[PDB]
PDB file of C-alpha atoms in Angstrom:
ATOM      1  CA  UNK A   5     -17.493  14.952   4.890  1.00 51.03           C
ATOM      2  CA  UNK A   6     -13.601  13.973   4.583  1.00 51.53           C
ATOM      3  CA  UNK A   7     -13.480  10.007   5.384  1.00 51.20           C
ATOM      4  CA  UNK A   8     -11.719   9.216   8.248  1.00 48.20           C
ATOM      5  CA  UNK A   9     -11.879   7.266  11.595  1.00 47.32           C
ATOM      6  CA  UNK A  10     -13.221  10.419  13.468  1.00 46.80           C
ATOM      7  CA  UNK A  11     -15.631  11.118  11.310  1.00 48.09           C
ATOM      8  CA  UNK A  12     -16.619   7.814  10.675  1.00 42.79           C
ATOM      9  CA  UNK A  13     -16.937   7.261  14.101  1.00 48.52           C
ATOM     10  CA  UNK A  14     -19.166   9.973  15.174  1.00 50.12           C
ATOM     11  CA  UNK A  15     -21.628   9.207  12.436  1.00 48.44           C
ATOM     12  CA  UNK A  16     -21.833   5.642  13.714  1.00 49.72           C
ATOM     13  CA  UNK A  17     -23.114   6.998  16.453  1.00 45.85           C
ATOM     14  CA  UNK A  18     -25.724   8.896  15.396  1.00 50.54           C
ATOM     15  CA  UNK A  19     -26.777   6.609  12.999  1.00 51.99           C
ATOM     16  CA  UNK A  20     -27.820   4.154  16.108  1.00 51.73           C
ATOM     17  CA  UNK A  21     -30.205   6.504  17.299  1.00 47.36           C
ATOM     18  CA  UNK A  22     -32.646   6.987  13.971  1.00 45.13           C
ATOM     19  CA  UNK A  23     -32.815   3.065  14.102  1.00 43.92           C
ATOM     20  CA  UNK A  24     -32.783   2.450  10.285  1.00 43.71           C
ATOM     21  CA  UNK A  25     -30.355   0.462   8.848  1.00 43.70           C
ATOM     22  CA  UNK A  26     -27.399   2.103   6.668  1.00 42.84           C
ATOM     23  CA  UNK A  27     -26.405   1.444   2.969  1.00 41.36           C
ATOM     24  CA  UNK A  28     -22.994   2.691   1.472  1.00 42.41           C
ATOM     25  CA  UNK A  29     -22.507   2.772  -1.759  1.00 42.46           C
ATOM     26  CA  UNK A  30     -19.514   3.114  -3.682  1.00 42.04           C
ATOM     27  CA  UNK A  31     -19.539   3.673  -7.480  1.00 43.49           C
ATOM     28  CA  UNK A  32     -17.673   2.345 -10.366  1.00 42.70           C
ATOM     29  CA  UNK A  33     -14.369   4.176 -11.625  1.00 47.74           C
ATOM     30  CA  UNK A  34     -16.280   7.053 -12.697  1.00 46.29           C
ATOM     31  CA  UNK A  35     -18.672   7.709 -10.270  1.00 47.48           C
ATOM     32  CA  UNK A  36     -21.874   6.857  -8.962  1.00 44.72           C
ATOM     33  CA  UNK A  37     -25.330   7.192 -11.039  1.00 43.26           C
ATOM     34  CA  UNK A  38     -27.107  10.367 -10.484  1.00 45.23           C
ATOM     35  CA  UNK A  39     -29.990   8.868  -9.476  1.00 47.68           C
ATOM     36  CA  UNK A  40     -27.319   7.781  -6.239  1.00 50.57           C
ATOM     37  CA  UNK A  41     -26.616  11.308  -5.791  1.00 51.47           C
ATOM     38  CA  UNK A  42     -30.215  12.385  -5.586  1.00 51.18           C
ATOM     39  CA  UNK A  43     -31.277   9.687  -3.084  1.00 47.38           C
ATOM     40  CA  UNK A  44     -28.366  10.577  -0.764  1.00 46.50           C
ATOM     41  CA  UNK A  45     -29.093  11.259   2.543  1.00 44.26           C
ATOM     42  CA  UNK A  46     -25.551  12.607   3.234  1.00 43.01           C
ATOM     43  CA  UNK A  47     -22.139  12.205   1.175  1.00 41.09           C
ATOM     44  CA  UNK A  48     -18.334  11.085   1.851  1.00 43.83           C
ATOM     45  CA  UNK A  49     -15.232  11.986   0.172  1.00 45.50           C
ATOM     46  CA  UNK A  50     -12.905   9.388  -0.478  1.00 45.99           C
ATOM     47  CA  UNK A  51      -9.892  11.865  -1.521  1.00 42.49           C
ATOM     48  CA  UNK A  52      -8.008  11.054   1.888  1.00 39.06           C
ATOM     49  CA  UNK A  53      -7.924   7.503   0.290  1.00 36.11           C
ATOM     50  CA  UNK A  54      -4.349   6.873  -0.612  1.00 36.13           C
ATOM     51  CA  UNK A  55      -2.505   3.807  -1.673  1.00 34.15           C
ATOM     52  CA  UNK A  56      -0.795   2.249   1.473  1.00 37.41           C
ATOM     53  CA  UNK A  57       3.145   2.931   1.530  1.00 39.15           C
ATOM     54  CA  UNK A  58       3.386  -1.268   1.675  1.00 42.13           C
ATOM     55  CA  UNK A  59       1.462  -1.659  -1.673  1.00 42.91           C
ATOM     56  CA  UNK A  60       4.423   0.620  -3.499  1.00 41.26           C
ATOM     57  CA  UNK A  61       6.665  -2.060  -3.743  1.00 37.37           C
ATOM     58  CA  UNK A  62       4.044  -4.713  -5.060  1.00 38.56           C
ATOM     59  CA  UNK A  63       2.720  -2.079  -7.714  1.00 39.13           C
ATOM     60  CA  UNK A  64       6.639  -1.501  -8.339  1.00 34.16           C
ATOM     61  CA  UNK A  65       6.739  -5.274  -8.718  1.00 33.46           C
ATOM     62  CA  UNK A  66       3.727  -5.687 -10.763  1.00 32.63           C
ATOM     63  CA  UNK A  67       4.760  -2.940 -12.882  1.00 28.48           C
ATOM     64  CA  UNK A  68       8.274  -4.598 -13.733  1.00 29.20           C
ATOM     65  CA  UNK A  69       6.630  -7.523 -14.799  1.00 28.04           C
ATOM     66  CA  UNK A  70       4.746  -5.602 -17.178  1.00 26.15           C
ATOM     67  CA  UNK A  71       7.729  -3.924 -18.597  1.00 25.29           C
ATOM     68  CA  UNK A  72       9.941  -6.987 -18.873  1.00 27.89           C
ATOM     69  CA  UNK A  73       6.997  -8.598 -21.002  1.00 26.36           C
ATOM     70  CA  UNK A  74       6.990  -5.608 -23.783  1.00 29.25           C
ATOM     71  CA  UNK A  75       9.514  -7.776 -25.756  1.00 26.16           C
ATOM     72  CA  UNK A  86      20.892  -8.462 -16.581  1.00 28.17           C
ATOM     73  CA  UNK A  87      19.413  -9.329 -13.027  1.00 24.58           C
ATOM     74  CA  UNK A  88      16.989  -6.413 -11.707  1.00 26.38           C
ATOM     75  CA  UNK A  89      17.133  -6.250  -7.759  1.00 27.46           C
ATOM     76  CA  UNK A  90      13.704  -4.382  -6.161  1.00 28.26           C
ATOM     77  CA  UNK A  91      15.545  -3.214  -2.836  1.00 26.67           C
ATOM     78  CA  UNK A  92      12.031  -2.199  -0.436  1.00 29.08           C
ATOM     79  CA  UNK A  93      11.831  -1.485   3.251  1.00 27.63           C
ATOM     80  CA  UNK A  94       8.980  -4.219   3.896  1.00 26.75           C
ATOM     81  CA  UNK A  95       6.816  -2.213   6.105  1.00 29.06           C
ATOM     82  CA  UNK A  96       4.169  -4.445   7.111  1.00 29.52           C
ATOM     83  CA  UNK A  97       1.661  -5.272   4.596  1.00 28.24           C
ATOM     84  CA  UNK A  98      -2.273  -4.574   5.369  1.00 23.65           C
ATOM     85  CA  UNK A  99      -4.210  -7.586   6.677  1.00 23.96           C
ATOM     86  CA  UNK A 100      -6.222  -8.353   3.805  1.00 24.77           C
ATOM     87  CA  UNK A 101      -2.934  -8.295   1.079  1.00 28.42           C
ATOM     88  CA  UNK A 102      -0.675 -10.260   2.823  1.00 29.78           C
ATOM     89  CA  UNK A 103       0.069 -14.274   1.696  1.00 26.80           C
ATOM     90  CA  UNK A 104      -1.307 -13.162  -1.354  1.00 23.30           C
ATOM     91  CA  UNK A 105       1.837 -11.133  -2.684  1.00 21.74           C
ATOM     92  CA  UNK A 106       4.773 -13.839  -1.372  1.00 21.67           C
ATOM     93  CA  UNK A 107       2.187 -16.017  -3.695  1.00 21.81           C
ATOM     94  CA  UNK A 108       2.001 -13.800  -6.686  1.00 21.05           C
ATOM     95  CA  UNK A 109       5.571 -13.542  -6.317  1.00 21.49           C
ATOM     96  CA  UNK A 110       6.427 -16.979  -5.975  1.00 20.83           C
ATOM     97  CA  UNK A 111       4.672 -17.815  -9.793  1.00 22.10           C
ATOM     98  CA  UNK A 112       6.544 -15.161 -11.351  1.00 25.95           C
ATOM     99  CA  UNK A 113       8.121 -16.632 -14.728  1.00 29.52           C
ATOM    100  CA  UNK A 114      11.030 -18.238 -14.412  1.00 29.90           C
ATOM    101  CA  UNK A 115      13.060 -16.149 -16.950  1.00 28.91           C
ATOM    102  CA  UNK A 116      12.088 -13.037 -15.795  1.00 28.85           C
ATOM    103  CA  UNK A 117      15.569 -12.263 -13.479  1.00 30.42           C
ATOM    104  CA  UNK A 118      13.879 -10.526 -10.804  1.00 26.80           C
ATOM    105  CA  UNK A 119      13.767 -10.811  -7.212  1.00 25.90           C
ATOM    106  CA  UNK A 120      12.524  -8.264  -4.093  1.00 26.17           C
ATOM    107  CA  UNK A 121      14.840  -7.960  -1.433  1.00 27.19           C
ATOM    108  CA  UNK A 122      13.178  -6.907   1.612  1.00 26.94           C
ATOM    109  CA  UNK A 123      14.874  -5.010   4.593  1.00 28.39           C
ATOM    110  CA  UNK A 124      12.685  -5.258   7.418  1.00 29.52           C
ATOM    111  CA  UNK A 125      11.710  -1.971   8.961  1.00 30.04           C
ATOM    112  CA  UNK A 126      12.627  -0.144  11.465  1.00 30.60           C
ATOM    113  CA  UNK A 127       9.631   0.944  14.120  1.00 27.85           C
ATOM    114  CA  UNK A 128       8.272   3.805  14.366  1.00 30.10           C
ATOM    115  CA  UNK A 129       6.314   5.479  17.097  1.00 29.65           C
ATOM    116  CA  UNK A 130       5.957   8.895  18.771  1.00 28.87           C
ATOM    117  CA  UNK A 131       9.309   7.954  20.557  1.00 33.72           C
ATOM    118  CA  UNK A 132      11.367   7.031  17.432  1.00 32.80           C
ATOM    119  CA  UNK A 133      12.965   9.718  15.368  1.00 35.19           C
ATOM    120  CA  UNK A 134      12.821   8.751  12.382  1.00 33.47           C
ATOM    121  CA  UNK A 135      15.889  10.343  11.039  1.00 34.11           C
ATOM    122  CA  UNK A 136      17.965   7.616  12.963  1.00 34.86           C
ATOM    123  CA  UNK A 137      15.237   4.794  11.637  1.00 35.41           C
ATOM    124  CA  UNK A 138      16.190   6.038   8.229  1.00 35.55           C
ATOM    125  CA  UNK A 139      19.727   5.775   8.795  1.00 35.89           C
ATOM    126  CA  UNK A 140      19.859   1.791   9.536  1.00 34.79           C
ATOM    127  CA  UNK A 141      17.027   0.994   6.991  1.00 34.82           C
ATOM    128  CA  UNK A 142      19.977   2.608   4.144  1.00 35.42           C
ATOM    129  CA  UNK A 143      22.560   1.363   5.506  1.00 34.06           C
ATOM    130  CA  UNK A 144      21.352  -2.045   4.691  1.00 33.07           C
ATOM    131  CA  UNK A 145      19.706  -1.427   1.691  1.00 31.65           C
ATOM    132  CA  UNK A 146      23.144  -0.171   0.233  1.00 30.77           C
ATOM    133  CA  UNK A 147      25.166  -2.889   1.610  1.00 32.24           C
ATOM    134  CA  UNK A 148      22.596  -5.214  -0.348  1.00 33.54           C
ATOM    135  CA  UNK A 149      22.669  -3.259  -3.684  1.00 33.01           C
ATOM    136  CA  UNK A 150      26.426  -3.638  -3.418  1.00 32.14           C
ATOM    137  CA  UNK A 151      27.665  -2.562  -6.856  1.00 32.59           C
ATOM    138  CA  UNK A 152      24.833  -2.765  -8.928  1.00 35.26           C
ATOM    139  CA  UNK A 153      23.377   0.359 -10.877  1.00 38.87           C
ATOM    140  CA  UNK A 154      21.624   1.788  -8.074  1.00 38.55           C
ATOM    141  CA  UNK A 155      17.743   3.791  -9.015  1.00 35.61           C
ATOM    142  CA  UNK A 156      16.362   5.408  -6.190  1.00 34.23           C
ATOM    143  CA  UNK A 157      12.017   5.284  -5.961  1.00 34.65           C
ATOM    144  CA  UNK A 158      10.695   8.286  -3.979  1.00 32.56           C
TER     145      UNK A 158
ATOM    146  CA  UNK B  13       1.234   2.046 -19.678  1.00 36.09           C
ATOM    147  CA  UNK B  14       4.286   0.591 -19.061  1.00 39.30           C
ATOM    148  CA  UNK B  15       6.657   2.356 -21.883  1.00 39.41           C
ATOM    149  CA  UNK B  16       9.122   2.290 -19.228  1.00 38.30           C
ATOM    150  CA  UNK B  17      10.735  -0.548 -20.932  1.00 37.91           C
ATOM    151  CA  UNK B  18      12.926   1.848 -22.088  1.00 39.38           C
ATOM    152  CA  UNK B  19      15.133   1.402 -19.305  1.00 38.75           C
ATOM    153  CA  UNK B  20      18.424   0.062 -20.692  1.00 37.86           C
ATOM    154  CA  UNK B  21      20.256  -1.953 -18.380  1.00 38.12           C
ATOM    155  CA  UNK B  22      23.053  -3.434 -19.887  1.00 35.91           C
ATOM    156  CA  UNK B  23      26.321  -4.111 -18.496  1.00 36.86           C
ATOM    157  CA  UNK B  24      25.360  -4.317 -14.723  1.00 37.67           C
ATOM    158  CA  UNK B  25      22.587  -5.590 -12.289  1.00 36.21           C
ATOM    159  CA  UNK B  26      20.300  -3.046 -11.571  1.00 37.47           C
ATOM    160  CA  UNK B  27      19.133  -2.425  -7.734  1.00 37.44           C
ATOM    161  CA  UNK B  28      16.051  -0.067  -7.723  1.00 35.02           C
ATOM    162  CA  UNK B  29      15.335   0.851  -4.127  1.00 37.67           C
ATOM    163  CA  UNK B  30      12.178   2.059  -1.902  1.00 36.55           C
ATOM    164  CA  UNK B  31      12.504   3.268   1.298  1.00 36.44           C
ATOM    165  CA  UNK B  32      10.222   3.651   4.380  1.00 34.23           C
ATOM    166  CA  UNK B  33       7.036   5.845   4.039  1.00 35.17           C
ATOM    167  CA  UNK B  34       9.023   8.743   4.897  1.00 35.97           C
ATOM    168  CA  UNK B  35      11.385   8.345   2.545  1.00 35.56           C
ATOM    169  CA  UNK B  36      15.142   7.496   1.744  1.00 35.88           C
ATOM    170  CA  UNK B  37      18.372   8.208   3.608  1.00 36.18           C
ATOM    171  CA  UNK B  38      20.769  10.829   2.891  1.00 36.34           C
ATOM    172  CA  UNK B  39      23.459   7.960   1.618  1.00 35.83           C
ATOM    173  CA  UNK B  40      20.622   6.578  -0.452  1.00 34.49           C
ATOM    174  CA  UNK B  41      19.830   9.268  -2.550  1.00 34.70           C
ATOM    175  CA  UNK B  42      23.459  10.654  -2.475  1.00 31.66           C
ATOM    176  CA  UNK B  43      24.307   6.674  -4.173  1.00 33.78           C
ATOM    177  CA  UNK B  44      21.603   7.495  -6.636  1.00 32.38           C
ATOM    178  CA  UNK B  45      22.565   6.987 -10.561  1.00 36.77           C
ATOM    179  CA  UNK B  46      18.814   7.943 -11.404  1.00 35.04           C
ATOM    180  CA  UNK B  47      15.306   8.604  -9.480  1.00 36.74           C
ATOM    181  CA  UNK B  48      12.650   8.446 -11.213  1.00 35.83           C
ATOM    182  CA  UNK B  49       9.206   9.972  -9.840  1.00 29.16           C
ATOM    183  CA  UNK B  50       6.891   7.779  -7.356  1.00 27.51           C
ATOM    184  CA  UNK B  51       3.723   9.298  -6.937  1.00 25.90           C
ATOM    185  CA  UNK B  52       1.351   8.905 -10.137  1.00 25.68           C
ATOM    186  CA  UNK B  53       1.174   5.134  -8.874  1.00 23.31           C
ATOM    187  CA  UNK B  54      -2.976   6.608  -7.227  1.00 24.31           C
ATOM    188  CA  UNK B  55      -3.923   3.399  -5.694  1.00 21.68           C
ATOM    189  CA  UNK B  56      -6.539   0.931  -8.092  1.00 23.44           C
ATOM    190  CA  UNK B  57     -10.044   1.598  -7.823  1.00 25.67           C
ATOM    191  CA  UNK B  58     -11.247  -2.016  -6.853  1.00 23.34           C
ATOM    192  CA  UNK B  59      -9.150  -1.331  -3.637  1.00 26.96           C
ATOM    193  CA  UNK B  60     -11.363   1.433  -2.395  1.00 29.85           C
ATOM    194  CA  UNK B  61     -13.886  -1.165  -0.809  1.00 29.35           C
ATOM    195  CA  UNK B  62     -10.891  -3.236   0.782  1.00 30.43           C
ATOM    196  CA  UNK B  63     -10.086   0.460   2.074  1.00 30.00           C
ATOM    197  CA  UNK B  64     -13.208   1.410   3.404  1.00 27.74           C
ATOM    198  CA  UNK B  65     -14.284  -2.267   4.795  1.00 27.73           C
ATOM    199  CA  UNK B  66     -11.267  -1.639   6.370  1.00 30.52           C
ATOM    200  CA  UNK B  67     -12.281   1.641   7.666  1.00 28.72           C
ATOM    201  CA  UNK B  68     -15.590   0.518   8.357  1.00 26.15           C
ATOM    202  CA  UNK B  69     -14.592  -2.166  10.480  1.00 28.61           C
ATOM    203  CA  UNK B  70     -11.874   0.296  12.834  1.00 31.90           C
ATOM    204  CA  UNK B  71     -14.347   2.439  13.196  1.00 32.53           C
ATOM    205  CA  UNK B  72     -16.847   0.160  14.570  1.00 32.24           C
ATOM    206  CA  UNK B  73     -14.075  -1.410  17.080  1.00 29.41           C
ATOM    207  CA  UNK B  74     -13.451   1.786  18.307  1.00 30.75           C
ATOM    208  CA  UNK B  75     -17.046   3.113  18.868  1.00 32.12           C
ATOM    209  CA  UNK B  76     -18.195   0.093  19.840  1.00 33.46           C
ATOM    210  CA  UNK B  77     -15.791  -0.793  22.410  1.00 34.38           C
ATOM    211  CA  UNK B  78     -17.058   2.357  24.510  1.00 34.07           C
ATOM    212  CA  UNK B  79     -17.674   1.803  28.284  1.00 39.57           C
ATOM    213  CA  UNK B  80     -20.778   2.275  27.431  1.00 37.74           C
ATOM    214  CA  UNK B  81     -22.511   0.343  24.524  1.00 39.76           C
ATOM    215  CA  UNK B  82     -25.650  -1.354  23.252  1.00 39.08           C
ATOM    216  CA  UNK B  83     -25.537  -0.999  19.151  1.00 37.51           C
ATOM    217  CA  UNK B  84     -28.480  -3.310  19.157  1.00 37.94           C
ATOM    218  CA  UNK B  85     -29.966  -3.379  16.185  1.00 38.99           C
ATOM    219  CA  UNK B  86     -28.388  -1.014  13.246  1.00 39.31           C
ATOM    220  CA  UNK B  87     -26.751  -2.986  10.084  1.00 40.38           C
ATOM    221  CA  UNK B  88     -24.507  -1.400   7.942  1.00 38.86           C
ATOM    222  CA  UNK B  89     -24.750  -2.705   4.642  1.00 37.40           C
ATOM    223  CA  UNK B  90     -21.178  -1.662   2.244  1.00 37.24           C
ATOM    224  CA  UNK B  91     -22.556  -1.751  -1.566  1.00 36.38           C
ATOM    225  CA  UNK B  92     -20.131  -1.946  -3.947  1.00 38.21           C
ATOM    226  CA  UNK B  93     -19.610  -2.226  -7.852  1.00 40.38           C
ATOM    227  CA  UNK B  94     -17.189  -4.950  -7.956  1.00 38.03           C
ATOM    228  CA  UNK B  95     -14.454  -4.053 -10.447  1.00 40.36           C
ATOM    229  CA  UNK B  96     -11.943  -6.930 -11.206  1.00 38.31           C
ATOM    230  CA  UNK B  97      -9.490  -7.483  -7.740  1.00 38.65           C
ATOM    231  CA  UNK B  98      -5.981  -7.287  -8.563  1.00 40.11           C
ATOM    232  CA  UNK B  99      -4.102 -10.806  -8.759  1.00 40.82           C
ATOM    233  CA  UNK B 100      -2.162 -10.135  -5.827  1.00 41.13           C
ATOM    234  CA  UNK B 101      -5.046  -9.451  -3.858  1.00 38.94           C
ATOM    235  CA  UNK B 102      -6.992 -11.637  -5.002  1.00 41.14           C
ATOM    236  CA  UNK B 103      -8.566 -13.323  -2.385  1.00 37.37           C
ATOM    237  CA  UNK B 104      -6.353 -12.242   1.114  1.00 37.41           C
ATOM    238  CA  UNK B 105     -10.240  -9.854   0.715  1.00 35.72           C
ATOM    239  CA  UNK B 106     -12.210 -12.683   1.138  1.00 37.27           C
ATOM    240  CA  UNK B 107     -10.028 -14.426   3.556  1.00 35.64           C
ATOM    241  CA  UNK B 108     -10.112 -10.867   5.276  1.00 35.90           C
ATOM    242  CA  UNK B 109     -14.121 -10.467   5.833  1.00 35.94           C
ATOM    243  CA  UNK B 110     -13.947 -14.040   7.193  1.00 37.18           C
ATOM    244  CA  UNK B 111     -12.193 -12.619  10.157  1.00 38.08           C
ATOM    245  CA  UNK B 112     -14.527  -9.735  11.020  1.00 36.50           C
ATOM    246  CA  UNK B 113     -16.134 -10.172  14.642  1.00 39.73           C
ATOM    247  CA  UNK B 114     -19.818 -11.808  14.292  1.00 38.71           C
ATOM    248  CA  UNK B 115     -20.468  -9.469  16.567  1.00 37.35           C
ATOM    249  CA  UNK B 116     -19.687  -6.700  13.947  1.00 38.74           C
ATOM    250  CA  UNK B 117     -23.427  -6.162  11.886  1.00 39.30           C
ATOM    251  CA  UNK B 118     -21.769  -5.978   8.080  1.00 40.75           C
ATOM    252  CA  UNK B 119     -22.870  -7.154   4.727  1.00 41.79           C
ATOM    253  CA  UNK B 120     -20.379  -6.653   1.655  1.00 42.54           C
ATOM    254  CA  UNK B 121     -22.528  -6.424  -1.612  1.00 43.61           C
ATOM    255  CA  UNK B 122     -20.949  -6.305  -4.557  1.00 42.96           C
ATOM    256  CA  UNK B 123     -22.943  -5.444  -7.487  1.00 42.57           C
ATOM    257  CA  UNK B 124     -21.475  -6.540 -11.363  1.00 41.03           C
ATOM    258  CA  UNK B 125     -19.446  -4.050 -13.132  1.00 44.12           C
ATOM    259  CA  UNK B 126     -20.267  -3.456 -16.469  1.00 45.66           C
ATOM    260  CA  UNK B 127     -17.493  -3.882 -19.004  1.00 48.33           C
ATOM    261  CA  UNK B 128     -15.731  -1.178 -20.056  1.00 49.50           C
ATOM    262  CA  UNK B 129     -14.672  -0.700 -23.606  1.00 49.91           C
ATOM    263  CA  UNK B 130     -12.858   0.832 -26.275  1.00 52.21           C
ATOM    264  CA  UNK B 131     -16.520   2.838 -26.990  1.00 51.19           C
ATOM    265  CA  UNK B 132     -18.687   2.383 -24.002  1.00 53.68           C
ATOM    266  CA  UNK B 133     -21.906   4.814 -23.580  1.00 56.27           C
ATOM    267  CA  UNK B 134     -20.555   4.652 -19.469  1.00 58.20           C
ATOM    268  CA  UNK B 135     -23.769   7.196 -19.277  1.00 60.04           C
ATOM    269  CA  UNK B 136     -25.710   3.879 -19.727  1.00 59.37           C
ATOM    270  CA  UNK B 137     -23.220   1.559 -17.700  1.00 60.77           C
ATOM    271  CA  UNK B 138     -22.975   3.940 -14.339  1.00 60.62           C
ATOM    272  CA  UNK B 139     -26.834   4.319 -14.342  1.00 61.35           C
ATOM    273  CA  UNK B 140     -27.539   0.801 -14.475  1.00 60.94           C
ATOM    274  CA  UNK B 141     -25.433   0.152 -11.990  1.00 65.43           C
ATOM    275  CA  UNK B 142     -26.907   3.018  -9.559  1.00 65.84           C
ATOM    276  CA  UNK B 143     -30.446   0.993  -9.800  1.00 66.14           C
ATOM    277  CA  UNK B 144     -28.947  -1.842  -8.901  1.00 64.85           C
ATOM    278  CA  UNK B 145     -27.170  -0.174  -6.250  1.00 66.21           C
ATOM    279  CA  UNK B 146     -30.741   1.169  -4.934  1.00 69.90           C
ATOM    280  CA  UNK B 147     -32.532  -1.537  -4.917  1.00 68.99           C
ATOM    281  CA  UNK B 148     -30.293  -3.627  -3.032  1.00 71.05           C
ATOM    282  CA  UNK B 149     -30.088  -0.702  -0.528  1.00 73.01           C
ATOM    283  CA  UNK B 150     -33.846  -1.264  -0.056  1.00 71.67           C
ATOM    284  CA  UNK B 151     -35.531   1.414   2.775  1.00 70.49           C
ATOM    285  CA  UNK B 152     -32.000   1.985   4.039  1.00 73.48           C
ATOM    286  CA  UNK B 153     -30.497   5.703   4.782  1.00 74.57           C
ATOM    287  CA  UNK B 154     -28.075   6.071   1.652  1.00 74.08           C
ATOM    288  CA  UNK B 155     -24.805   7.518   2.127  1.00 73.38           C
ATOM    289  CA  UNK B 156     -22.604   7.779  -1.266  1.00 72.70           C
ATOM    290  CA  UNK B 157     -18.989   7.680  -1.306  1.00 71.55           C
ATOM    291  CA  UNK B 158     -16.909   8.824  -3.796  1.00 70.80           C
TER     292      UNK B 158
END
């Protein structure tokens, strides 16, 4: 019912067993049809979707953009956690053909790893530290 | 939409900062001159079927990589309404399904989205696009997400 790798996985499974072949369909912004929900065999929620902590900082970007256009140097500071496999190129590009009065630029601090053995408290620590020394003295705004 | 424009630099360089996924450091937020919220940024719908290809596909290398196997013969077919990509994603998605395993039985379908308008009967557009959704789902088991 929730949509996750477990789940998913264990219904693969069974599906390969009935033999048929499996659609999934995914409706517009609003939903999906009614006659969808009436020819279901079974139904997923996507409310475990969430936006990927590495996409913040290009909807931050994106978002900037859009504000500078309703009409000195803004600095986005981000922890570059790895972006997902399908995204990246395609934001250093986006990026790169930004307009050329628009005094922007991302400063990425590359992040520190995490894993069951890192605590994270210390990963935190270094990731600041950096990201302060590079704001320097500017007016410093915070995004959490 | 973006009435943030508000924000009134003037006199310095502004540094707005984001942190790791679990957030910022004590001497970060203790430097803080403002904070401003970050969570009603809820993730654009045409990235749900990058999501859940991307799902799809971990779950299948997982299950599939068993020690013991033999998916044979069962296609999963991903049928999608294909809202506008994002620019800055534009096509790392296409790139991306170029790189799934042949091995992997997937089809992407994406079926046209229906514009959406300043008065749009959206009754009309959303059951148009279910047909469409059905009939290229064929004899298959259905499984909606939403």
């Amino acid at each position: 019912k929730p949509w996750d790798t477990p789940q998913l996985a264990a219904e693969l499974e069974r599906w390969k067993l009935d033999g048929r072949d499996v659609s999934l369909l995914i409706g517009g912004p609003e939903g999906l049809s009614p006659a969808c929900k009436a020819a279901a065999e079974q139904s997923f929620s996507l409310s475990a979707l969430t936006l990927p902590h590495p996409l913040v900082r290009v909807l931050v970007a994106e978002s900037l953009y859009r504000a500078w256009s309703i009409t000195m140097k803004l600095q986005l500071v981000a922890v570059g956690t790895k972006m997902p496999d399908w995204v990246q190129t395609g934001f250093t590009e986006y990026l790169r053909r930004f307009p050329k009065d628009m005094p922007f630029e991302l400063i990425e601090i590359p992040a520190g790893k995490r894993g069951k053995n890192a605590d994270i408290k210390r990963i935190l620590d270094k990731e600041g530290e950096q990201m302060l020394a590079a704001a320097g003295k500017n007016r410093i705004v915070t995004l959490d």
